[PDB]
Amino acid sequence: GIGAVLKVLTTGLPALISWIKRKRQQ
16 A cells, blocks of 8 residues: 555655664754
8 A cells, every 4th residue: 555655755764763863863
């Protein structure tokens, strides 16, 4: 289904928030 597929390209990128924001807001 796409429910999540369209929710990945709308905020961050699934886990990116704990990937780059975790590496940038340190």
